[PDB]
Amino acid sequence: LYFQGSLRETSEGVILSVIVAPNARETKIVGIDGTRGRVKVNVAAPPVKGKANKELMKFFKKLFGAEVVIVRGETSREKDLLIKGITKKEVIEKLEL
Numbered sequence: 001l002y003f004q005g006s007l008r009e010t011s012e013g014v015i016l017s018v019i020v021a022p023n024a025r026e027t028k029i030v031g032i033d034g035t036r037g038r039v040k041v042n043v044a045a046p047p048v049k050g051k052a053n054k055e056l057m058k059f060f061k062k063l064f065g066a067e068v069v070i071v072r073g074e075t076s077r078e079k080d081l082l083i084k085g086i087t088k089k090e091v092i093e094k095l096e097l
């Protein structure tokens with residue numbers, strides 16, 4: 001039940017709670033934070049001109065096959081992503097790949 005601490009399903013989809021580190025060598029999931037209930041995501045983009053947000057959304061849109069929007073934390077390392085029109089079961093399956 002590893003990724004479950006970072007996700008919740010609302011009427012609109014799944015809110016995936018992440019904590020980003022920019023300037024990374026590769027955009028990828030590197031861990032979970034068990035106290036904050038967030039997936040640690042490295043993002044291979046600079047945190048300028050919204051480029052880390054853009055890369056983060058692109059990565060998860062490709063992973064889930066669904067539109068991903070930042071609902072909270074646009075200017076924070078702690079960001080909540082709405083994965084629109086997907087279920088928690090589908091998100092867990094994809095995160096576990």
Ligand code: NA
Pocket residue numbers: 046047048049050051052053054
């Ligand atoms: Na950014």
